[PDB]
Amino acid sequence: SELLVNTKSGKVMGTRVPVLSSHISAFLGIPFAEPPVGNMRFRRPEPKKPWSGVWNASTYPNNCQQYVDEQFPGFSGSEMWNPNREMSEDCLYLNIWVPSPRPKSTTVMVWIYGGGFYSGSSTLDVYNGKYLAYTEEVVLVSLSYRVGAFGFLALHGSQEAPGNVGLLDQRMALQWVHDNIQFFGGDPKTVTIFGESAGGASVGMHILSPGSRDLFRRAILQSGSPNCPWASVSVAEGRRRAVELGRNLNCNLNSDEELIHCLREKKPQELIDVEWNVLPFDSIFRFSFVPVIDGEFFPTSLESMLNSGNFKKTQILLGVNKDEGSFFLLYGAPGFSKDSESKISREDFMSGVKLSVPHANDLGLDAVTLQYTDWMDDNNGIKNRDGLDDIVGDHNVICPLMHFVNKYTKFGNGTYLYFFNHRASNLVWPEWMGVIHGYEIEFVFGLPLVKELNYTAEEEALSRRIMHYWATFAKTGNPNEPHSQESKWPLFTTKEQKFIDLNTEPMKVHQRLRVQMCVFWNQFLPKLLNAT
Amino acid sequence: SELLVNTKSGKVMGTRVPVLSSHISAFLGIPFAEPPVGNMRFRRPEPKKPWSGVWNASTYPNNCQQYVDEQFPGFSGSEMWNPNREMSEDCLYLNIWVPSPRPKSTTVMVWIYGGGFYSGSSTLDVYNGKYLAYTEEVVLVSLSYRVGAFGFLALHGSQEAPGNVGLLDQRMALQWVHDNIQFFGGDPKTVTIFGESAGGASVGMHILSPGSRDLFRRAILQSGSPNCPWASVSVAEGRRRAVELGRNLNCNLNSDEELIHCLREKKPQELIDVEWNVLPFDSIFRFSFVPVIDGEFFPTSLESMLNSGNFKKTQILLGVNKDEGSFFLLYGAPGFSKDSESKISREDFMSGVKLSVPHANDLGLDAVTLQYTDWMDDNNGIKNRDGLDDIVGDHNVICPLMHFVNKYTKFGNGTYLYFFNHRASNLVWPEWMGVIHGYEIEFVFGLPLVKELNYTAEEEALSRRIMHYWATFAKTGNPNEPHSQESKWPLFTTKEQKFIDLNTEPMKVHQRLRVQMCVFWNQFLPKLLNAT
């Protein structure tokens, strides 16, 4: 049977799922590691002990314990991101979508969800791999990893909570793919990992880490990068937040042992409730427990690794969305509303700047503010709002990714950059928010192909176009189909620095993606903050 | 006789000079102070001892000893600024242009030439007061003052060279006007001082200094301001440059007395030759001996005086030219030529930035460079050239004047701001230089009315329009003629901050004159340099 597959860990029973007037094989909820529960909370993952019999992989697995956003109850805009399955520490499972008939050895794509390392699921509707798997005849895998303290609490030195375990749960699933994806008709030698936001960062991080480089062929990074200011913390900061978490839960902070002895006895929700209390500053686009530069998973600092070319050299495709900042302003900046144009007064604008660059000293805040203020019209509400969006977006996503793309292209074997700027005709979020962070996902997973979702023809066209770039890229290391006749997406070069739009209009090649502001964020500001 | 006038210092014999198919009285070379020669070099001025007989005031006086620019020999563009008369320490004279028939008591205008306090003359063709005096029926006075070491060498404490003496020679001439201008048919109670570049600064400085406030009614400042970074130095810097000058001339630096004993024995040219050697940094738009914040002429720092409103409160009219920087780049920045478009390479561009802000530390130079670099097209030659022009212009003239105008309007009794941006159709300087620093002068003095000068009708119109604004303003404290029907030049307000163009096209009202860059220069950069 096509739905029965024997893996090195045991037999698995898939399920035939319908997809666009046809069907395909789906092996959902396959375990790749032992349930990281009890004495195992915070510890690195352990490969799943082989099981006897046939594992039922027909339903979706549970979602890792995480903070659930309830800012907008019943609003599909936000709940589309909340866990749609039961929450449980036992959550290290992976889902697979195999074409039917099963291909012999085709291109595989592994999805690493985002969520700022504090949330995320592999089972969200917007991550349904059938449409992509089916349409571009690829074996699509959707892994999972621990978020929050569970996946990133870091007491460096300790082996009971070494940190980056979540990043390890990812490596393991990627490992399991390396060892078993062949049995599903997927070529382990053509695995392309791709993720968004924290997922994008995670991707870049596996490029960086020596311990992951041989676990994939190519990589796609979406609105995220290893060097994103929120993507990680030092060992000192990590420890500080672990002890702070402890202090928040009347934990014995006298030894790395009993601090964890304590954390392991607390119910998951207890940790989640006091999770954000350990952040250093009042802010936005900052998350409590994230990857830590331990010196093992990350040999040296991310900057030094990027400058020395100490990272996997392959081809990479990546880009950002036009309005990467609105989502975060809506949630944490004063003046923003889901029910109005969100015109920001000069006073809120400044509250936002400070909330956006919490680590900057007053001279820095002044630099930022000056850089994003139109002094000819400083009290324009629309301009302040759009400014904050660019600040948050430029500082947290776009510029860090551009620094990465520039640093990487000097050693890589090919770079393809995009700028998604298409606002869905059915978006439920208000207009002011534009092309929000993460809303390119649905286009990558083919959601516009589902007529019920109420998308427009042109939008179906864009999605089909994107899925193909991604697929073709994962398959050849080049978004462009050979001899093809449409406009070619130029390779990003250190000299030309070309990228393309991603919308329903004819493709436009561009250059130096927001080089002006990124020169500020990547070079000037860093120097100002280090000097002063 | 109309050409004979008895003043409190003695009788003076004027001369009838032709002006635009008519004539007017001109009393040239009238002494207002004792020849600051010998033991008097560097000392404050002494009022001219009354003389017996009739003083021959029919020819122009000598020009103060100064550095003469010989960069472009025989080029009218530069020589129009060099002394056109014999040079001599005995140079404290003033010229007057009285309408004929002699008015009873009309508006007087006193011109203070510029030249960065190191050069300048009252006898230049571009400062011929007949055209303005005749056309707008005003008594036009053109004073003179010591420049260079002679007028500004400062050894604070010493009374043998107290500093600011040049600024005093100005006050004295202004005093003589207060005491005698009535005999020439000029109302001493309606004296409007107006100057350009250093002259503009000097004007603002008489507004500031308590010892000058009662010596004029109104004031016009052109492309210059009291707070211009080059317009003055601290007492410490002043002293340092005096001792440095000494050291340059094998002078005994052991006592303020014999340092001067030495300087007074050196021939003028000897001082001029080593004059620029005392500047702190390699630079442009910086001059050796300039006003010093002594604590007497300037009670406290210029900044504190401006913030506390410690200055004469009257109406003021002022503005700048569009390309205030090209003149200086041509002379001191690498890459510039009088014979080419002057496209500046990225390398020269940076040499220029550093030469333009010699006091800035690397972080500052980075700020400046970042602020004026178009990273989408950083190697555009035309863009770098135009950038340097704005940097020099914004930093040395426009922004300091805007800081001044903003600070002043909060206490003043009326402010009128202009932005001269008309390029003369007969300019001899290359196109790239645009509306050069100081080339609005000819329009203020009516040179376009002289058909031989080969100006265009529209240009004659502009000049006649300017002369009238200046005149009308000096006469009423408002550039606008009552009930007049043309477009009114709006008052500059702290809230509206309106100003007008000054070119051959219909008048356009504007706002926030280069507020973006001036926020950088007036607020951000100062803070960056003080913090780091």
Ligand SMILES: *[C@@H]1O[C@H](CO)[C@@H](O)[C@H](O)[C@H]1NC(C)=O
């Ligand atoms: C598990 O598989 C069985 C058939 O083997 C079937 O009931 C169903 O697909 C799965 N059970 C659940 C949770 O529905």
Ligand SMILES: *[C@@H]1O[C@H](CO)[C@@H](O)[C@H](O)[C@H]1NC(C)=O
């Ligand atoms: C990738 O590597 C191959 C093998 O050396 C080389 O021929 C090719 O030029 C590289 N492609 C790019 C654009 O990096």
Ligand SMILES: *[C@@H]1O[C@H](CO)[C@@H](O)[C@H](O)[C@H]1NC(C)=O
């Ligand atoms: C001085 O006045 C006399 C007449 O009194 C006449 O020669 C001329 O205008 C002046 N002298 C000079 C320097 O030409």
Ligand SMILES: *[C@@H]1O[C@H](CO)[C@@H](O)[C@H](O)[C@H]1NC(C)=O
């Ligand atoms: C100037 O001062 C007079 C006298 O107080 C006042 O009435 C007038 O409003 C002032 N004008 C301006 C615009 O400062």
Ligand SMILES: *[C@H]1O[C@H](CO)[C@@H](O)[C@H](O)[C@H]1NC(C)=O
């Ligand atoms: C199209 O989209 C909506 C929103 O998800 C969905 O509920 C339904 O399939 C369509 N809307 C309707 C009911 O027409």
Ligand SMILES: *[C@H]1O[C@H](CO)[C@@H](O)[C@H](O)[C@H]1NC(C)=O
């Ligand atoms: C107009 O201007 C020139 C330049 O100053 C001047 O020499 C002359 O009066 C006119 N040019 C000629 C000779 O036509």
Ligand SMILES: [Mg+2]
């Ligand atoms: Mg324990």
Ligand SMILES: [Mg+2]
């Ligand atoms: Mg214990």
Ligand SMILES: [Mg+2]
């Ligand atoms: Mg926006």
Ligand SMILES: [Mg+2]
């Ligand atoms: Mg296709």
Ligand SMILES: [Mg+2]
């Ligand atoms: Mg295809």
Ligand SMILES: [Mg+2]
């Ligand atoms: Mg002596």
Ligand SMILES: [Mg+2]
């Ligand atoms: Mg002596």
Ligand SMILES: [Mg+2]
């Ligand atoms: Mg220019």
Ligand SMILES: [Mg+2]
């Ligand atoms: Mg007139």
Ligand SMILES: [Mg+2]
């Ligand atoms: Mg008139």
